[PDB]
Amino acid sequence: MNGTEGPNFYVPFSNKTGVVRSPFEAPQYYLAEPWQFSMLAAYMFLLIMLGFPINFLTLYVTVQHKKLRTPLNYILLNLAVADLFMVFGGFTTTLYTSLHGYFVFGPTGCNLEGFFATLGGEIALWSLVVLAIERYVVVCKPFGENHAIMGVAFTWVMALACAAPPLVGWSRYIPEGMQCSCGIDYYTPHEETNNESFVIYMFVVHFIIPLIVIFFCYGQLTQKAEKEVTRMVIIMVIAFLICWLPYAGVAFYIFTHQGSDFGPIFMTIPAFFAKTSAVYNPVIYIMMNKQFRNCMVTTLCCGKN
Amino acid sequence: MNGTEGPNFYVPFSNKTGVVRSPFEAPQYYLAEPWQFSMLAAYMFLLIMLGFPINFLTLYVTVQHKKLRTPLNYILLNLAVADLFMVFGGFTTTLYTSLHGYFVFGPTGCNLEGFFATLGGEIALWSLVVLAIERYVVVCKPMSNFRFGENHAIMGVAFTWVMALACAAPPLVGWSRYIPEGMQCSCGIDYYTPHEETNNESFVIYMFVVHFIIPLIVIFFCYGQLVFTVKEAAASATTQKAEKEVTRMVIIMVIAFLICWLPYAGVAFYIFTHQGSDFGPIFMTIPAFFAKTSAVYNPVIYIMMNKQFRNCMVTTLCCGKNPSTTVSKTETSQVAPA
Ligand SMILES: *[C@@H]1O[C@H](CO)[C@@H](O[C@@H]2O[C@H](CO)[C@@H](O[C@@H]3O[C@H](CO)[C@@H](O)[C@H](O)[C@@H]3O)[C@H](O)[C@H]2NC(C)=O)[C@H](O)[C@H]1NC(C)=O
Ligand SMILES: *[C@@H]1O[C@H](CO)[C@@H](O[C@@H]2O[C@H](CO)[C@@H](O)[C@H](O)[C@H]2NC(C)=O)[C@H](O)[C@H]1NC(C)=O
Ligand SMILES: *[C@@H]1O[C@H](CO)[C@@H](O[C@@H]2O[C@H](CO)[C@@H](O)[C@H](O)[C@H]2NC(C)=O)[C@H](O)[C@H]1NC(C)=O
Ligand SMILES: *[C@@H]1O[C@H](CO)[C@@H](O[C@@H]2O[C@H](CO)[C@@H](O)[C@H](O)[C@H]2NC(C)=O)[C@H](O)[C@H]1NC(C)=O
Ligand SMILES: *C/C=C(C)/C=C\C=C(C)\C=C\C1=C(C)CCCC1(C)C
Ligand SMILES: *C/C=C(C)/C=C\C=C(C)\C=C\C1=C(C)CCCC1(C)C
Ligand SMILES: [Hg+2]
Ligand SMILES: [Hg+2]
Ligand SMILES: [Hg+2]
Ligand SMILES: [Hg+2]
Ligand SMILES: [Hg+2]
Ligand SMILES: [Hg+2]
Ligand SMILES: [Zn+2]
Ligand SMILES: [Zn+2]
Ligand SMILES: [Zn+2]
Ligand SMILES: [Zn+2]
């Protein structure tokens, strides 16, 4: 076998050498060297020490600033809060997992690792949706503390309809690559949870569609200021595709070819790269939005414009 | 002329267009697009956001935990401060400079930016020598009965500061000088102009000899000695392999150092030789700026390879509890000598 399956895992390595051990009981240092694991744990340490200040600052500013209540400001606060969950709920476990070369925290840790990452990306994928329409309405012209809170609520509803099932009984979060990150069970059919039907679902209801919607809405496209809130949204959407296509693409190749001879590094890259999703959004924000950039500076200098 | 030489600078651009302008009076947008200056400003902003906490937590942890006092634990508190000094002393001035397209605060803004980047780079280099030594005295069977105390640790720290100031202070006093580099938002040692009357051709030879080759010779010869025992393998104050974990670490900090300062040192030596030659702004911006990650990686390695210190910041961050010999002044921090 080009792989080693367990009742709850799947290590991309042949146990013909009788060296493959569970990602839950012993380090996976027989997959890659101990330097690449501490390298991952360093990356995770950085993502943590940036994802926190940057998302929380963002959170503290829109909350602190009285005149910061645009749907954009709402969606961007959302991401800042989802990015914080990613960081504490998820990044916490993935940091300590790498520091041990396996899931020391057990499955509760694998679930923590995957739920917040999927919730993370899905809230982004869904908030990018709540934004695309707003731009078909304030630019293609067919809001506020009213409707933005429904889009913001809706993003959690939808994201949760994706990150929540593998926790209860539809699909399962399972260690990927160097067995340090967890994601949807693309690897096995597992008749018991038919993650074969969940992947066909997640890929359509939480990937394909949400995207085509962000597309035709875009294809079907103060009065001069909306061009920069647009160019931002456009950019936000593009940066998301860069985090998730490398992943989602790799994730699908595997779902269809369940059994191939791929290695651990194969999915470790698109998967660990994708975690910048927790930090990248609030950077585009300062960059192309004179309103926030200035208001953030005011939160820092305590008044000196 | 391939470059406009001023009494204070050297813009790597040609003024046969009159488009060049003093990096102390106007933005250097003519040297390259505005968005590139925006990326430097973003980049510096992200470094200041990381270098601060990472370095400050590293700092706050060592002080609070009363038994975290080995030469290593010491020499690494030194780096958190030097890095914080970079973050505030230099980095604050490098981000304002990028945001505005030139050195608005002028020559002192160039001095603070260049001084604290050199000071921090050298606080680093020399600390690697006090540590490369520390390693020897412990691993390759040295002395006869000796063991390091806190006292020895402070002398190495005091030494690194004198050796870093010995390199960074002169350009503020008249020996060589801090001049803007690349896109003109970073400041370093003058390798560009002869300026025979501040002794430029002189200092650069001194700095590269005394503040680069030598410490590297020593650090490399010590590492050559620590092959008698600790070859290359190492697979926290617990047993025999507690030192092998420190040595393997101290041996990584040297590799990181290289990757960080070689590019800069390399492209900087090129210039000193090929002065007046045709190079662009971008040329030096990259090594220079990448090198600025120097204010951030040391504690990253520390809290990654030191099982004792890590659990210690995890103890600090978790208010005292935590769900390896206990040294954090949190968890039976009582003495255990003899
Ligand atoms: C991969 O194939 C090897 C065959 O070489 C399997 O080896 C077996 O590994 C399990 C744990 O993965 C061992 O069980 C445990 O043994 C220890 C003592 O060594 C005991 O304390 C535990 O309670 C448990 O019984 C088993 O001894 C070992 N047997 C062999 C062949 O050495 C291995 O299970 C396979 N890995 C997987 C799970 O895919
Ligand atoms: C082990 O991995 C190899 C390589 O991915 C698999 O071989 C391929 O199998 C597909 C059919 O699913 C063929 O179309 C390819 O031509 C094969 N490639 C080769 C081997 O040249 C193989 O099926 C895998 N073994 C298992 C466990 O199914
Ligand atoms: C490049 O050549 C131009 C050609 O004049 C210089 O421009 C003059 O600079 C002085 C001093 O800053 C100004 O007072 C003049 O107004 C400029 N001349 C004009 C109006 O064209 C420029 O200084 C040279 N580049 C540098 C700064 O070295
Ligand atoms: C202007 O720049 C040119 C090119 O960068 C300098 O000319 C160099 O002269 C050497 C002499 O050995 C030639 O071999 C090179 O081809 C030239 N450039 C290089 C190093 O590639 C010239 O000296 C500069 N002019 C001044 C004096 O500033
Ligand atoms: C680092 C941990 C990771 C990447 C775990 C899980 C990720 C997912 C379940 C992602 C799902 C998707 C998202 C977030 C956006 C594009 C579509 C998708 C299904 C690949
Ligand atoms: C971002 C600003 C910078 C990097 C300014 C100045 C840097 C130096 C003077 C560096 C000197 C050196 C160090 C720190 C270590 C290797 C040798 C060296 C001379 C290149
Ligand atoms: Hg749109
Ligand atoms: Hg990205
Ligand atoms: Hg404001
Ligand atoms: Hg050494
Ligand atoms: Hg570096
Ligand atoms: Hg500790
Ligand atoms: Zn099962
Ligand atoms: Zn299938
Ligand atoms: Zn010369
Ligand atoms: Zn640990």
DSSP annotation string for B67-93: T--SHHHHHHHHHHHHHHHIIIIIHHH
C-alpha A106/C-alpha A127 separation (Å) is 31
C-alpha B132/C-alpha A130 separation (Å) is 57
Between B150-168 and B106-139, two packed helices, what is the crossing angle to 10 degrees? Answer: 140
Kindly give, in sequence order, each residue whose CB lies less than 8 Å from that of residue A115, ignoring residues fewer than 6 positions away: A89, A90, A163, A164, A166, A167, A173
The kind and range of the H/E element at B178 are strand B178-181
| Phi, psi for B144 (deg, rounded to 5) | -160, -20
Strand, helix or coil for residue B180 = strand
**Does residue B165 sit at the A interface (CB-CB below 8 Å)?**
no
Print burial letters for B60-99: b (CB count within 10 Å at least 16), e (below 16).
Answer: ebbeebebbebbbbbbbbbbbbbbbbbbbbbbbbbbbbbb
C-alpha B184/C-alpha B285 separation (Å) is 8
**Does residue A41 sit at the B interface (CB-CB below 8 Å)?**
yes
Residue with the two structure tokens 């679930």: A111
Cα–chain center distance at B329: 29
Strand, helix or coil for residue B202 = helix
Kindly give, in sequence order, each residue whose CB lies less than 8 Å from that of residue B126, ignoring residues fewer than 6 positions away: B159, B160, B163, B164, B215
A260 CB less than 6 Å from ligand 2?
Answer: yes
Residue with the two structure tokens 């959004």: A281
List the structure tokens of B14. Answer: 């040609």
| Phi, psi for B187 (deg, rounded to 5) | -135, 135
Structural contact between residues B117 and B111, judged by C-beta atoms closer than 8 angstroms: no
Q: Is B287 exposed, middle or buried (0-12, 13-18, 19+ CB in 10 A)?
A: buried
What Å distances lie between residue B285 and A147, B184, B268, B291, CA to CA?
46, 8, 11, 10
List the structure tokens of B152. Answer: 């020895």
C-alpha A158/C-alpha A122 separation (Å) is 8
CA angle A291, B186, B295 (to 5 degrees): 85
Breaks (C-N over 2.5 A) in chain A follow: 142, 221
C-alpha B203/C-alpha A100 separation (Å) is 48
Please state the domain count of chain A.
1
C-alpha B256/C-alpha B261 separation (Å) is 9
| Phi, psi for A166 (deg, rounded to 5) | -60, -10
List the structure tokens of A7. Answer: 């009742």
Residues of A in contact with B300 (CB under 8 A): 42, 45-46
Residue with the two structure tokens 């809170």: A149
B166-175's contacts with Cβ under 8 Å and 24+ in sequence apart are B166/B210, B166/B211, B167/B118, B167/B122, B167/B207, B167/B210, B167/B211, B168/B115, B168/B118, B168/B119, B168/B122, B170/B203, B171/B111, B171/B114, B171/B115, B171/B118, B171/B203, B172/B111, B172/B115, B174/B198, B174/B199, B175/B199, B175/B202, B175/B203
**Does residue A106 sit at the B interface (CB-CB below 8 Å)?**
no
C-alpha A75/C-alpha A127 separation (Å) is 6
Strand, helix or coil for residue B187 = strand
Structural contact between residues B89 and B121, judged by C-beta atoms closer than 8 angstroms: no
Structural contact between residues A278 and A46, judged by C-beta atoms closer than 8 angstroms: no
Q: Which amino acid is at B251?
A: I
Please choose, from the candidates A114, A53, A62, the residue with its C-alpha nearest in 3D space to the C-alpha of residue A84. Answer: A53
C-alpha A254/C-alpha A185 separation (Å) is 10
Q: First vs last Cα of chain B: how many Å apart?
A: 71
Q: Which domain holds residue B261?
A: 1-338
CATH number of the structural domain spanning residue A276: 1.20.1070.10
Please choose, from the candidates B118, B109, B92, B90, the residue with its C-alpha nearest in 3D space to the C-alpha of residue B24. Answer: B109
List the structure tokens of B168. Answer: 């960074």
| Phi, psi for B247 (deg, rounded to 5) | -65, -50
Q: Which of B40, B50, B251, B302 to mutate to test the interface with A (most CBs of A within 10 A)?
A: B50
Structural contact between residues A115 and A159, judged by C-beta atoms closer than 8 angstroms: no
Structural contact between residues A239 and A202, judged by C-beta atoms closer than 8 angstroms: no
Q: Which amino acid is at A31?
A: L
Of A45, A50, A54, the CB nearest to B303: A45
CA angle B19, B25, B30 (to 5 degrees): 30
C-alpha A173/C-alpha A244 separation (Å) is 17
C-alpha B174/C-alpha B183 separation (Å) is 25
CA distance A104 to chain B (A): 13
DSSP B10: E
C-alpha B277/C-alpha B264 separation (Å) is 18
C-alpha B245/C-alpha B79 separation (Å) is 19
Structural contact between residues A11 and A177, judged by C-beta atoms closer than 8 angstroms: no
C-alpha A144/C-alpha A52 separation (Å) is 27
Please choose, from the candidates A190, A184, A166, the residue with its C-alpha nearest in 3D space to the C-alpha of residue A5. Answer: A190
| Phi, psi for A174 (deg, rounded to 5) | -140, 135
List the structure tokens of B65. Answer: 């935990």
Q: Is A258 exposed, middle or buried (0-12, 13-18, 19+ CB in 10 A)?
A: middle
Atom of ligand 1 nearest to the CA of A11: 39
Structural contact between residues B197 and B300, judged by C-beta atoms closer than 8 angstroms: no
Of A46, A283, A286, the CB nearest to B300: A46
3-state secondary structure B91-113: HHHHHHHHHHCCCCCHHHHHHHH
**Does residue B305 sit at the A interface (CB-CB below 8 Å)?**
yes
C-alpha A125/C-alpha A158 separation (Å) is 10
List the structure tokens of B208. Answer: 């590269």
Residue having the nearest C-alpha atom to atom 8 of ligand 3 = B18
Handedness of CA A131, A136, A138, A143 (dihedral sign): negative
C-alpha B104/C-alpha B98 separation (Å) is 10
Q: Is A6 exposed, middle or buried (0-12, 13-18, 19+ CB in 10 A)?
A: middle
How were these coordinates obtained? X-ray
3-state secondary structure A265-297: HHHHHHHHHHHHHHHHHHHHHHHCCHHHHHHHH
3-state secondary structure chain A: CCCEECCCCEECCCCCCCCCCCCCCCCCCCCCCHHHHHHHHHHHHHHHHHHHHHHHHHHHHHHHCCCCCCHHHHHHHHHHHHHHHHHHHHHHHHHHHHCCCCCCCCHHHHHHHHHHHHHHHHHHHHHHHHHHHHHHHCCCCCCCCCCHHHHHHHHHHHHHHHHCHHHHCCCCEEEECCCCEEEECCCCCCCCCCHHHHHHHHHHHHHHHHHHHHHHHHHCCCCCCHHHHHHHHHHHHHHHHHHHHHHHHHHHHHHHCCCCCCCHHHHHHHHHHHHHHHHHHHHHHHHCCHHHHHHHHHHHHCCCC
A117 CB less than 6 Å from ligand 5?
Answer: yes
Residues lining ligand 6, CB < 6 A? Answer: B 114, 117-118, 121-122, 125, 186, 188-189, 207, 211-212, 261, 264-265, 268, 288, 291-292
- Listed in sequence order, the DSSP H helices in chain B are 34-64, 71-85, 91-100, 106-139, 150-168, 170-173, 200-208, 214-225, 242-250, 252-273, 281-291, 297-305, 307-317
Strand partners, B4: B11
